[PDB]
Amino acid sequence: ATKIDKEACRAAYNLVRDDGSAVIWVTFKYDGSTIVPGEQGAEYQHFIQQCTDDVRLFAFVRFTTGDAMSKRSKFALITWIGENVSGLQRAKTGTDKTLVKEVVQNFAKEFVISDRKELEEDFIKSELKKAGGANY
Secondary structure (H helix, E strand, C coil): CCEECHHHHHHHHHHHHCCCCCCCEEEEEEECCEEEEEEEECCHHHHHCCCCCCCEEEEEEEEEECCHHHCEEEEEEEEEECCCCCHHHHHHHHHHHHHHCCCCCCCCEEEEECCHHHHCHHHHHHHHHCCCCCCC
16 A cells, blocks of 8 residues: 655755756655655765665666766666565565656666665666666
């Protein structure tokens, strides 16, 4: 019976999109059975710390790559699933992403990760490089 606070998760989503905002990541978490905004920041390293072993969550992160005239904004939708989270949870969570993709309309790529080493900034960017264009 998972649902989501669209009206609220959309504000966060838009906050990471808007360039002049400084916010580069917003999390979406389970607040019972209703998915809602978690934390957000300007520092990517602070996001990795939201991804503990007993939590599962969703994220929308703006990655900047290249430089000068080659600068491009790579958005990524991420589903962090704690290694120490239930078994039904992991699968039930993969179900709810559908519900999350209703607000989080476009992203160059999506991830289902449970090993922080995968959130390593330069590795995740490498991965966004091998991807391509948005997702409507």
